[PDB]
Amino acid sequence: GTIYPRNPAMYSEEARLKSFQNWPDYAHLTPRELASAGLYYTGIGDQVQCFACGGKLKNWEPGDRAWSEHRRHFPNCFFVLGR
Amino acid sequence: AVPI
Ligand SMILES: [Zn+2]
């Protein structure tokens, strides 16, 4: 194909959800919301990554939403643009 | 959030 995900295994929303097993207790966004927006836990801090574009997001602020941060910083992501 |  003409597009290719940065992380094929994290193609699955269920796989992405599992990656949050050790999501830190201070991190306020839910695994459900993050995984739905294409994001999985990198295992470092509150840093997540998109399976599709490979962009990383960290240092989440109150009022941040997963999708709106993903679209704001990585607008040309195929997952963002396919939503 | 902050992007990388
Ligand atoms: Zn993306």
Numbering used by the authors:
A (entry chain A): 151 to 233
B (entry chain B): 1 to 4
Paper passage:
XIAP (X-linked inhibitor of apoptosis) directly inhibits the upstream caspase-9 and the downstream caspase-3 and caspase-7, and therefore controls critical apoptotic checkpoints. The XIAP protein consists of several domains, including three zinc-containing BIR (baculovirus IAP repeat) domains (BIR1, BIR2 and BIR3) and a C-terminal RING domain. The linker region blocks the active sites of these caspases, while the N-terminal regions of the partially processed caspase-3 and caspase-7 bind the BIR2 domain in a peptide-binding groove that accommodates the four N-­terminal residues. As has been reported previously for other BIR domains, the overall architecture of the BIR2 domain is a three-stranded antiparallel β-sheet surrounded by five α-helices, with a structurally important zinc residue coordinated by Cys200, Cys203, His220 and Cys227.
